[PDB]
Amino acid sequence: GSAKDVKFGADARALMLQGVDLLADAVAVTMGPKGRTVIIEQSWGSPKVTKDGVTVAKSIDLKDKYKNIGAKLVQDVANNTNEEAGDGTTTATVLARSIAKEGFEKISKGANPVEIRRGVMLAVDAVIAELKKQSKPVTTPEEIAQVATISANGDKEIGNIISDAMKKVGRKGVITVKDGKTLNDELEIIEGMKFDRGYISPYFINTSKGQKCEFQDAYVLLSEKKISSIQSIVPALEIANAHRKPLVIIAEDVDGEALSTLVLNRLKVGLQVVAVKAPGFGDNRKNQLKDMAIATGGAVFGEEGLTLNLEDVQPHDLGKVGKVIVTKDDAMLLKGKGDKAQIEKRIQEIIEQLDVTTSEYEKEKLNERLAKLSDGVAVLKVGGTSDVEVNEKKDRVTDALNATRAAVEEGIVLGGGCALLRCIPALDSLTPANEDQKIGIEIIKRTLKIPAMTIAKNAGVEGSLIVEKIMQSSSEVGYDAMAGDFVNMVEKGIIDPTKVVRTALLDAAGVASLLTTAEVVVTEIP
Amino acid sequence: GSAKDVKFGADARALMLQGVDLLADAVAVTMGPKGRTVIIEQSWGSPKVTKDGVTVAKSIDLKDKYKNIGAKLVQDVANNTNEEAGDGTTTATVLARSIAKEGFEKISKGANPVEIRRGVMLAVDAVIAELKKQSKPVTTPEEIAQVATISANGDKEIGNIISDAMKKVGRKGVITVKDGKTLNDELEIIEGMKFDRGYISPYFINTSKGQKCEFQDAYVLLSEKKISSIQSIVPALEIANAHRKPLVIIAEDVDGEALSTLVLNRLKVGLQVVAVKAPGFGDNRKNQLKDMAIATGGAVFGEEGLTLNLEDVQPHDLGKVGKVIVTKDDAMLLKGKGDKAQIEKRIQEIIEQLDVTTSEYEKEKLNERLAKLSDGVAVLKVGGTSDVEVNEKKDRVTDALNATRAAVEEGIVLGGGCALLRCIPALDSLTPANEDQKIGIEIIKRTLKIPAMTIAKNAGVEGSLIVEKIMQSSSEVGYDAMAGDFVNMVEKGIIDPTKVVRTALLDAAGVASLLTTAEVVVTEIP
Amino acid sequence: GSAKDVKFGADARALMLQGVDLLADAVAVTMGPKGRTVIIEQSWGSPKVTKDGVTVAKSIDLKDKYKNIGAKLVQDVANNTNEEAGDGTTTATVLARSIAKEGFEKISKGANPVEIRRGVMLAVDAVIAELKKQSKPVTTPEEIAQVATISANGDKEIGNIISDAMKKVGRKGVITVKDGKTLNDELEIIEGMKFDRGYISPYFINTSKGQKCEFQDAYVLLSEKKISSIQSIVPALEIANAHRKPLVIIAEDVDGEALSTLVLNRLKVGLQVVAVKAPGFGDNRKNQLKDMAIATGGAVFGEEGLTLNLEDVQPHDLGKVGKVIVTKDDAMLLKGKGDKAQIEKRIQEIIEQLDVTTSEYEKEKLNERLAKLSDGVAVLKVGGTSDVEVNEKKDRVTDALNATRAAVEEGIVLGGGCALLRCIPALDSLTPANEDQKIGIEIIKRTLKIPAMTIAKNAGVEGSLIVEKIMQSSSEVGYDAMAGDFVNMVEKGIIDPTKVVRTALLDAAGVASLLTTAEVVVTEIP
Ligand SMILES: Nc1ncnc2c1ncn2[C@@H]1O[C@H](COP(=O)(O)OP(=O)(O)O)[C@@H](O)[C@H]1O
Ligand SMILES: Nc1ncnc2c1ncn2[C@@H]1O[C@H](COP(=O)(O)OP(=O)(O)O)[C@@H](O)[C@H]1O
Ligand SMILES: Nc1ncnc2c1ncn2[C@@H]1O[C@H](COP(=O)(O)OP(=O)(O)O)[C@@H](O)[C@H]1O
Ligand SMILES: [Mg+2]
Ligand SMILES: [Mg+2]
Ligand SMILES: [Mg+2]
Secondary structure: OOOEEEEEOHHHHHHHHHHHHHHHHHHHHHOOOOOOEEEEOOOOOOOEEEOOHHHHHHHOEOOOHHHHHHHHHHHHHHHHHHHHOOOOHHHHHHHHHHHHHHHHHHOOOOOOHHHHHHHHHHHHHHHHHHHHHHOEOOOOHHHHHHHHHHHOOOOHHHHHHHHHHHHHHOOOOEEEEEEOOOOOOEEEEEOOEEEOOOEOOHHHOOOOOOOOEEEEEEEEEEEOOOEOOOOOOHHHHHHHHHOOOOEEEEEOOEOHHHHHHHHHHHHHOOOOEEEEEOOOOOOHHHHHHHHHHHHHOOOEEOOOOOOOOOOOOOHHHOOEEEEEEEOOOOEEEEEEOOOHHHHHHHHHHHHHHHOOOOOOOOHHHHHHHHHOOOOOEEEEEEOOOOHHHHHHHHHHHHHHHHHHHHHHHOOEEEOOOHHHHOOHHHHHOOOOOOHHHHHHHHHHHHHOOHHHHHHHHHHOOOHHHHHHHHHHOOOOEEEEOOOOEEEEHHHHOOEEEHHHHHHHHHHHHHHHHHHOOOOEEEEEOO | OOEEEEEEOHHHHHHHHHHHHHHHHHHHHHOOOOOOOEEEOOOOOOOEEEOOHHHHHHHOOOOOHHHHHHHHHHHHHHHHHHHHOOOOHHHHHHHHHHHHHHHHHHOOOOOOHHHHHHHHHHHHHHHHHHHHHHOEOOOOHHHHHHHHHHHOOOOHHHHHHHHHHHHHHOOOOEEEEEEOOOOOOEEEEEOOEEEOOOEOOHHHOOOOOOOOEEEEEEEEEEEOOOEOOOOOOHHHHHHHHHOOOOEEEEEOOEOOHHHHHHHHHHHHOOOOEEEEEOOOOOOHHHHHHHHHHHHHOOOEEEOOOOOEOOOOOOHHHOOEEEEEEEOOOOEEEEEEOOOHHHHHHHHHHHHHHHOOOOOOOOHHHHHHHHHOOOOOEEEEEEOOOOHHHHHHHHHHHHHHHHHHHHHHHOOEEEOOOHHHHOOHHHHHOOOOOOHHHHHHHHHHHHHOOHHHHHHHHHHOOOHHHHHHHHHHOOOOEEEEOOOOEEEEHHHHOOEEEHHHHHHHHHHHHHHHHHHOOEEEEEEEOO | OOOEEEEEOHHHHHHHHHHHHHHHHHHHHHOOOOOOOEEEOOOOOOOEEEOOHHHHHHHOOOOOHHHHHHHHHHHHHHHHHHHHOOOOHHHHHHHHHHHHHHHHHHOOOOOOHHHHHHHHHHHHHHHHHHHHHHOEOOOOHHHHHHHHHHHOOOOHHHHHHHHHHHHHHOOOOEEEEEEOOOOOOEEEEEOOOEEOOOEOOHHHOOOOOOOOEEEEEEEEEEEOOOEEOOOOOHHHHHHHHHOOOOEEEEEOOEEOHHHHHHHHHHHOOOOOEEEEEOOOOOOHHHHHHHHHHHHHOOOEEEOOOOOEOOOOOOHHHOOEEEEEEEOOOOEEEEEEEOOHHHHHHHHHHHHHHHOOOOOOOOHHHHHHHHHOOOOOEEEEEEOOOOHHHHHHHHHHHHHHHHHHHHHHHOOEEEOOOHHHHOOHHHHHOOOOOOHHHHHHHHHHHHHOOHHHHHHHHHHOOOHHHHHHHHHHOOOOEEEEOOOOEEEEHHHHOOEEEHHHHHHHHHHHHHHHHHHOOOOEEEEEOO
């Protein structure tokens, strides 16, 4: 309630630090190839198992409200990093703890934690600069499989399947991931404009092999309203029999006398028509039919909303497609012709929508997969023998996917944690304005060493020996903690996307340096 | 979120292992011929009695949340096995515990439990290979009765009755199991298309013995809409009296003037018609009536899309059936004529439908029972003197049924637990990549011995003596724990379907090897 | 007996390790020049402040009986180290924790912790060997002041004053330490055989300057009984006036007519006698008079067994001393003649006495100072403005004293912690018999780095960076943590006695390696 309780200084700082340290200690066991999993109790079902830092971090709230404040801030950093990049979460967590501890310890009476924060931010800017300098953009699609396999915790089959899918769909094409029933992974590739609606009548079937309606060089008619008996349908058929092409009709429904005309002209004078229901869900179907309209080139009849009526059609009011296949369950349209400019406009609209949409009514992606399917889309059906396994593997696959996209879009840099280690000399050539800022730069200078020593510590080895051996060693070499020895990093394939290394550090330092500024904490009473 | 509490390392591992060990210890007493039952309190009724591993596992949740985590994972194993195979449950449980214990014990600081998991999974693949090598596909229907009787815990009458039903319905036909009212088991066989709806009026009755309407060489009319209509019924009767054959009419209802015409023409000019309500209800009736349509050859009237109206019928638009019997409660149609291609097509559709997501798609099985082999379904009415007896017995019968199907569809292999024991040499010829994987292969190597040693331990004998005596002995011989001595296994009838032995091991290792990877556990506070 | 409760495996190991880690964490803040003090509540008085590892360790018992078991064992190592060497205590604790942690972590199912102990002990033998190779025996008395000053936490005045006392009393002479009343330190040196008893009569005084009785080349008479004379004194006076030497008389008392004869012969015909009461009291006084007997030569009169009577004295039954000074409060005897063999036998007797006997009846040391005063003894009156200051400082002085003695008697080796670091290559050339022993040697190999990394960590610097920089650097150079930079170690004065470095490690590894062998813990119920 309204009643509250407050705490002052290094005592409260030590409590919040206890919370930070607890959550970080829980998260940090997952890090690297020799990292380990964390089980989390689920309220309704069987427990989650995960190696994902952020999903561990969000799962931990604390009874002690101050420790819970620390915990909430650390899961804030891990969540921000997962949102902005999709990997690098554990790294962001251990970094955030390091900045928070090294920050808290250096505070005194004469010290000015805000200015120290300023120094830290100077140092992180200076670091990401040198990171971008270090970045070398991806070229060979072997590097893709490397980034994927490393982000998937050494599963080569994952990074292989991601590499081939990314080849067959394109580096900025659509790849999505979902559960299999198969015990193994599967790559499915869809081409066209597929949606889960089938012919209204069996009588439309043409091949008898598969029981499909198969057409080529066809037109498409798009109706936002039902087409019942009105014979607003017939001109669309006269115009169709005119140009001797097959016709597909997509509508809210097609029934009454209209359908009877359709399967009479189909069954008696082998006319080539098929009719299918609009993909259909209330207001969503309008957006879908407008999508298929824009893709296939042409316009939707019926509206709210303006109105083009079905009685007055012209050949430029239809749609035009290279091929079409329909079954009892689903309809696929292929090589539809329209303005590519306008379709890229449409995709640019839906992506810019999706990005600002706050809402997990994810059909907006279901839209985006469709109109982008004229390049292709890949479905990643993940296997395994049990649901918890499937959720683990899928977490890792999604991580590797986001990592590969970050790699192609920004760059790749050394793995292990070496990429941050090499940035220390850039800090050595800084010019601090005052003691506080110098403390900040020192904090970052120590903090950069952390991820690599942590990956080594999880391996069971003397991590800080390994860090210093790496620093003494040349720029191209680092520590392979899985193989347990030093190697050329890029040659052995140990590499991290630059975007993730950037975002982990920037977010972690960003919230932790603010945390270190605290002098008074105010919390609700139990 | 909710306040939480976390635990680190071998302490938490020891707690989860306490839970696993408790649940496994409860489940494992049921194993084998000398196994024993477990009573489970029911909230509302008299207590359950069972020998089923999975039903034991599902019944046990634990107050200690960590132990409950272990327990939940083990019941996940037993449930996955029961879903995927239907018998191998106790085995999957004891296997899962063995992998979990032997896993947990071998972890240290330098160890890499993920890599150990990889080694374990390697070992399971290598084992299942040799299992498939060992598999000999079923041939004689004596072997059917053998797998059934062993899966039914030695009840010969069960495997006899299952053998009879499977003979008289076919190896991939439909057998179902239900309560008797009789003190003994009964095999009933239904032929045709039975459903639980009766004549609307008594006046339709023809036999006076049984009070049935009995027809042969009859026509059938299928209406999705009600027929209360004035004379939208009549042409359908004129066409029937024309070809002098009996007519059955199935509709949402027949109730208005139509019915009056029906029983006037019935009572005054003894025409052979009966009318019955559609099987019901709602959207289900559509699928059922289309099923009976497709089976009897012909089409459904009323609204689908293309509407065929009741006023315009033709003889090829009805249905044609070898025989029909109807009473007050149920209607059976027999030897209906239609394209067998189209009906097998339909069954192929419903099985691929039902594939997702039975909870609860129970009526999809009620459809498949109707539309599958219009010459072939079996009901297994199990007897006994009390409900608890009936339920235990029915659990065993369902187990034996699933076992017989797994045997017919994949194969049979040695019983006792010997089939897994013989796979050990295949592990002996493996080539582990590192120490961790070697630990994994060792874990599986120890774990394979468990089921046989457990079946012997339940017998009251020195199970691990028996295991080693078996291993020293030849491939064809194993331990008959009921008879208390060694015998040729296949000759004496002790055999297990390969599918269950495969799935138990695969699921158990699949979840337990993941469990062993845990380093931190996070649970809700009480 | 008492109801009890037992715990199994890594759970109990983690509990005991929690206790160890708590106590070690408390002790370890004291380490090195930048180390810090620990306040301990006293039950009766004002709280202790200390930098002494062992005194911190002894103060911490724990409510949780298992954690208390760990704590008890760690204070056991620290106490053993303090007893056997007198410094190196914090070091023994941090080593013990390192061996205990690294030990516990490496345990698994296949592991054999006793054999691991064997490997650890092998490693400790091998390291102390190389330590003895590194040792260079002390030479210049500058090195003394260096060892003292470093062991006194950088107080140069302490090591100066210790150097002075050790010069003027000898390297194996007696130095003792006690509270000053002065605000500054004082070195007092006593020569002779001093004790706190004065002339019975003022009339004995001869010098009038100071009011002392001063004699040279004198005789001494020792009587265990009172002398209220039967004129058992007169032959002893005739024998003294005969050989014209002064006579000092030490007795239980000098009384009655004896004293009258004494100060009559004193005030008249100026005879040179003095008489003083025995040092006292009771049975202690017997041992003291026999001590002075053996030192000054001659024999003690009165009843022991064989009774030597005062009536029959001979000059070889008296005693012979170079000088004597007595005042109202105390008596000092100087350059007493007797068998030096017999004197060293006597001190060797008293040390072997005190060493086995433990009532804090400290007079056995008061004996040792007396009979060893003919080399000399130094009292170290420590100053300060408050009792707590005096006690902390005195702790440090006693530490430096014991350290200087260990340095003189065994040797000196590199400070910082470098001396243990340089021994790692000696471990690198070992030949382990099996995996367990190899684990042990690895444990010691990691543990050797600890003291230096801890001294650096207390400084606020990246200790494990510093360790590796030191290892990369030459043998003669290490890290001056007070000055905050690398230096030649021996040149800068940072050096540790070899005995303490040996004993800390030997004790710590000795108990901790045994601790790691535990599988079951048994404790009393609260
Ligand atoms: N075989 C390996 N050797 C050395 N470093 C590795 C290896 N595999 C992965 N890494 C490093 O470990 C990190 C992977 O962290 P991860 O466990 O995925 O947590 P996050 O979710 O924070 O990425 C990367 O920075 C990568 O460079
Ligand atoms: N008489 C017997 N001798 C030896 N083994 C037997 C005998 N009867 C059954 N078994 C074995 O016991 C196992 C049956 O386990 P069961 O108790 O049904 O539990 P589950 O639910 O795992 O099937 C089979 O693997 C079978 O080989
Ligand atoms: N200026 C210095 N530089 C490096 N090491 C130092 C310095 N002064 C002291 N030490 C180290 O500190 C250790 C003594 O720590 P101390 O606090 O006395 O603990 P302990 O009671 O275990 O001796 C010695 O090993 C010595 O080498
Ligand atoms: Mg990752
Ligand atoms: Mg069974
Ligand atoms: Mg010391």
